[PDB]
């Protein structure tokens, strides 16, 4: 998984080489800037429950045909809405990831590759979720630092679904 | 290659979780204690031709056998390519203690290694026993009370010995 | 690869000898069965994708362990290259069924390819299954009696679910 | 083996990709044809012993010293005479065969390949085979497009031969 | 590889010693005796096609189940490829005498053959028995009195059919 | 290993053919020049001990520091003289192996491949060895074509030493 921590040893693994004390400096800039991260995370985490559900219905209220048209990619049915609600807490804890891990690796390897083809495939519409991660982001509470990390990596999933 | 942070949430994600909050602590602990690491790191890199060329000399003192002629580490190649592994486990032992996390060590440098050794009949116990040499030396610099302020990194020292340790126990 | 003509060829030539009127007659019969063979390959050639979302979501309304976290369909990545290996199966199912012999798919797919899973931990037996779920649906859409000068195709699905029951039991 | 039908498929398999419905009409193509094909090779097969032996005793006249000259490489011994017709049978066999495939993808791998080789180091004349090759021809008594089908792996050896 | 003069001196190596008297005279043994070993190599080379040919001709007259249709030296293609094999090793087996040596054989010749053929299904017991035809006639050649200045060579043609001895035992 | 030898062999198998007359007259050459190259290296072996002990003490004289200064690399303990005439000894060695293999393959394989990076971890100086082979050199009482070989596998060293 790339990290700045993992990026740095790379680099250093790459040209066969103890690592620099400009490789050491980014880490300690890392570490100084993990602090406010892990807590944005930490407050995510705990706020999870309220955050899924309210983004789940912040879907539906935006496109109500996804709760009446018939199908199983739709959540007309129990099992629909249990799969919408599963797959908004995966996005959200792959923020928390990104927060934790200090950058987008996490979400890159557990969410993004492969995404276009399974939205494709199970016949899931990219909107859908880009609707969810912009009620977390009203909704998060976060603020100063932590509001923009977790903004990029929120605004980085809507890319990667645009 | 996982560090300490990935390698927490890679154990997460497995169980489709959320960090707990002793997860979250123990992270927060490892930061909290991250200059230390960053000094162990900084002060084995400095000195890592001389704990390779000490671990060397010790070796040999105490396996003359390796430098008889016949011996795995006699003629110059053979002595250089030792040399040069010497180096190449500190240095990914190095990459292992900056990042809090074996994987780069077991994923680039150890896992086929025992077969590698077996196949050239290169005796992996007395590479073990060099790799151990390399970590006492390795801490004693790392854990050098002078020039530094004062404070506890035992801690610290015995997850450097682990990765060490992990090395030794991954060839003998 | 072979097809139907090739393997009756190779087989006569390790005996040496000439056809004989079985295999003659045998290979006579194949091509006075074509059309319905090349309306088979059409017919799930069109539908694939179809065939691949809709066997994927029936394996996994039955085997929900394998898309719970941890499982081996779990991550978008691991998701696509199930479904990849799923379209890749089928792609070499439909060139044996036009071939009228299995070798393109053994040779090209299937070999190696229990030790592939096994390396990875990838369940060979519920590929099986996914490519069962295939084999069903392939069959009702290359069987379907609406749109099609009828007659009857029992011979040629009798040979078509070998292809697929071949690939999964190279797998389970 | 390369026929018109592994051609189409190792087409489609080289592009990742299902077949296409050129490639399929072009083994339709096949299937209406191998009908005279395999028409063809079952009447040389039918007739394959008087062909056989025909041949041989054309090779004999056109080149007597064949059946004095001392070598175990001529047929101036039973056991060369043997390994003549067995020879000539196997150059017949292989003609059926490319009918049967329809290409010449049998005789490729079961005689030509590694051919040049063969008669070059057991000391056996190219002329003599042509000759039989050349006798089949004029006495197989096929008519129609299956003369130009037997004809042409005939001629296609005779060039391998040249 | 190695030649004779190599070999004494990686023996003497690995025991960190000087040449002995033994090891001296045995190289000295060698070269007074070298023009016999030239006279033997110029004689193998110079009839090598004729040795592989003839060799070949005797082992499918002894087993005729070679060259039945579905035998391994049936079709041009597989007997091309066994004519190959035996002018491969004889070529080795020349680099072997003229080296006085056989580890340019071992290492770059049969090292690896008996599995290459296992796997082939190609019958290492008959590729040793043309091994021992070439052999015996290559000897013949070496060692035929006419043309030659008289003299006694039968150590080196124990030597040679050593070397041509290894080779088949490396395949039966 | 190369010798003249093995370079023919190789030759002929880079080209994937049997030997030519040419590489078969460059063997014939390489015997005869192998008569004396051997008994040089037997003359050597002969008087080693004197050659290397005489080495050494030329050495000390020197270069004085090496029997006095304090360091496991330095010949001021037994254990350090020991190893040093060790080493001496190593090089003459491979210099009685180069006469008897026709090149120098034996240093080449034994010595040389890894000696800068051994000097350079161990603190050893070359020019410590530089003057142990001029000793040599000056002493082995080897004449004619036997001094030629001889001096030119020992003045190879010393190239690889400077
Ligand atoms: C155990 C290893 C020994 C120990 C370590 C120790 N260090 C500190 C404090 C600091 N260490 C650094 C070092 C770096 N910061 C960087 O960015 C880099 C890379 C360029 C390095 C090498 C720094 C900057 C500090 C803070 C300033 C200072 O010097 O104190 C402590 C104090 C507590 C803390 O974690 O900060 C300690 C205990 N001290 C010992 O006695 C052990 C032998
Ligand atoms: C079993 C599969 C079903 C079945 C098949 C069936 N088909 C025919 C006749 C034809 N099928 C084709 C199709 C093609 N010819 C081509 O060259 C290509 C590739 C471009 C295709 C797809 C054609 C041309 C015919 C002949 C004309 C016609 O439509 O009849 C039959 C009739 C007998 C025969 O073999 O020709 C049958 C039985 N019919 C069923 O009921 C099964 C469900
Ligand atoms: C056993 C192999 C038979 C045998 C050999 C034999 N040869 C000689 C003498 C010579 N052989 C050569 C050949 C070469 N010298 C080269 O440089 C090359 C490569 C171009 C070759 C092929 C030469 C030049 C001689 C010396 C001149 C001569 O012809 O005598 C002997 C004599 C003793 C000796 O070793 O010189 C012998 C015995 N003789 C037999 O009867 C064996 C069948
Ligand atoms: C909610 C916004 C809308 C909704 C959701 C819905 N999703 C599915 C099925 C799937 N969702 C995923 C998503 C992921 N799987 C992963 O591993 C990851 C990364 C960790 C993600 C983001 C996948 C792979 C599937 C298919 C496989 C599965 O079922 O798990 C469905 C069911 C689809 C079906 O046809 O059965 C639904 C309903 N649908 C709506 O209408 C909501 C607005
Ligand atoms: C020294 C303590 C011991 C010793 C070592 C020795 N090793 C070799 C050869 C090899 N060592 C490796 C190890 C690695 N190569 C890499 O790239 C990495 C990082 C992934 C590692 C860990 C390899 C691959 C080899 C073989 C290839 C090569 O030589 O480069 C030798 C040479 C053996 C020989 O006979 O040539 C030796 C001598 N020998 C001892 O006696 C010590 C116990
Ligand atoms: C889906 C039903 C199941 C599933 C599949 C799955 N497969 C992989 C990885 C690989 N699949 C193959 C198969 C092939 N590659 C080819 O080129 C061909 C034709 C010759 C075949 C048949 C290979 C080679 C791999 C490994 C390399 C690669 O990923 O491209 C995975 C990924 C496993 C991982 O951990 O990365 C998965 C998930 N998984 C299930 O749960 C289903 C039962
Ligand atoms: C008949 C026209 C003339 C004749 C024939 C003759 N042939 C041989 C020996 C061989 N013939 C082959 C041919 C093939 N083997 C294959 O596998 C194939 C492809 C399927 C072919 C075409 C081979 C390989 C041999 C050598 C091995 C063997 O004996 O089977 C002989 C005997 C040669 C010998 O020296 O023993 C003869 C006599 N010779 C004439 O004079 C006829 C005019
Ligand atoms: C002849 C006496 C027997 C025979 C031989 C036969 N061999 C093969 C195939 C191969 N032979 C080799 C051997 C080598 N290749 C090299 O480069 C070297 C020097 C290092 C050697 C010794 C190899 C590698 C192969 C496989 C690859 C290739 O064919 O080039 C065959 C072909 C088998 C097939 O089915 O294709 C045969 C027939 N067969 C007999 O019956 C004789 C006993
Ligand atoms: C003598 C001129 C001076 C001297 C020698 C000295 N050497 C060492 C240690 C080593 N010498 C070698 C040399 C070789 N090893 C090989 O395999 C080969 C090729 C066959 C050679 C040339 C090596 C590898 C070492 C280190 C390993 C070992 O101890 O064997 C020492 C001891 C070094 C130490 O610190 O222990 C000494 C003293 N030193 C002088 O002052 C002499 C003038
Ligand atoms: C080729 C390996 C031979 C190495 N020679 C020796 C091996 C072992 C010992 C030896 O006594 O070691 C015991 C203690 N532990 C650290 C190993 C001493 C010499
Ligand atoms: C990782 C593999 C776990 C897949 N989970 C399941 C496996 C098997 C079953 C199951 O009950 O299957 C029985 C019938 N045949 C078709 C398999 C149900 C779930
Ligand atoms: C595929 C291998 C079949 C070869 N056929 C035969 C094998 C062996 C014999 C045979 O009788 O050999 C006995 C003597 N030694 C030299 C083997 C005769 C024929």
Redesign the interface.
């Known amino acids: 998984?790339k990290?700045p921590?993992?990026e740095?040893?790379?680099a250093?693994?790459t040209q066969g080489?103890?690592?620099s004390?400009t490789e050491?400096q980014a880490?300690?800039g890392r570490?100084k800037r993990?602090?406010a991260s892990?807590e944005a995370?930490?407050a995510l985490?705990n706020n999870?429950q309220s955050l899924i559900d309210g983004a789940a219905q912040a879907v539906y209220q935006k496109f109500p045909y996804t709760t009446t048209m018939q199908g199983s990619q739709y959540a007309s049915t129990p099992e629909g809405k249990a799969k919408c609600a599963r797959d908004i807490g995966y996005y959200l804890?792959m923020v928390?990831?990104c927060l934790?891990?200090?950058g987008t690796?996490?979400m890159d390897e557990?969410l993004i590759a492969g995404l276009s083809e399974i939205n494709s495939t199970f016949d899931l519409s990219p909107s859908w979720y880009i609707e969810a991660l912009k009620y977390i982001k009203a909704n998060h509470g976060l603020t100063g630092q932590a509001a923009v990390e977790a903004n990029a990596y929120i605004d980085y999933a809507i890319n990667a679904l645009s | 290659?996982?560090?300490a942070?990935?390698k927490?949430?890679?154990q997460?994600?497995?169980?489709?979780?959320?960090?707990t909050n002793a997860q979250?602590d123990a992270?927060?602990n490892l930061?909290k204690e991250?200059?230390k690491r960053?000094d162990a790191?900084?002060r084995i890199?400095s000195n890592?031709s001389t704990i390779?060329?000490n671990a060397?000399?010790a070796l040999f003192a105490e396996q003359p056998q390796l430098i008889?002629?016949?011996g795995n580490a006699?003629?110059?190649?053979?002595?250089?390519?030792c040399?040069r592994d010497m180096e190449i486990i500190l240095?990914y032992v190095?990459?292992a203690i900056?990042?809090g996390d074996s994987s780069?060590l077991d994923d680039?440098c150890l896992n086929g290694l025992r077969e590698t050794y077996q196949a050239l009949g290169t005796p992996g116990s007395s590479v073990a026993v060099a790799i151990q040499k390399m970590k006492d030396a390795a801490i004693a610099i790392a854990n050098d009370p002078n020039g530094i302020t004062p404070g506890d990194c035992s801690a610290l020292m015995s997850e450097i010995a682990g990765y060490f340790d992990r090395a030794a126990a991954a060839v003998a």
Request: charged share 15%; aromatic share 10%.
């Open positions: 998984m990290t921590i993992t740095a040893i790379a250093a693994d080489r103890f690592l004390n050491l880490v300690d570490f993990a602090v892990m995370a930490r985490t999870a804890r928390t990831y934790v891990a200090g690796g996490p557990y | 290659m996982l560090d942070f990935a927490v949430v890679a997460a994600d497995a169980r489709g979780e959320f960090l979250f992270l927060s930061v991250g200059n960053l790191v900084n890199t890592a390779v060329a060397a000399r008889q002629p016949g006699y003629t110059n190649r053979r002595m250089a390519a040399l240095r190095t990459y900056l990042a780069v680039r």
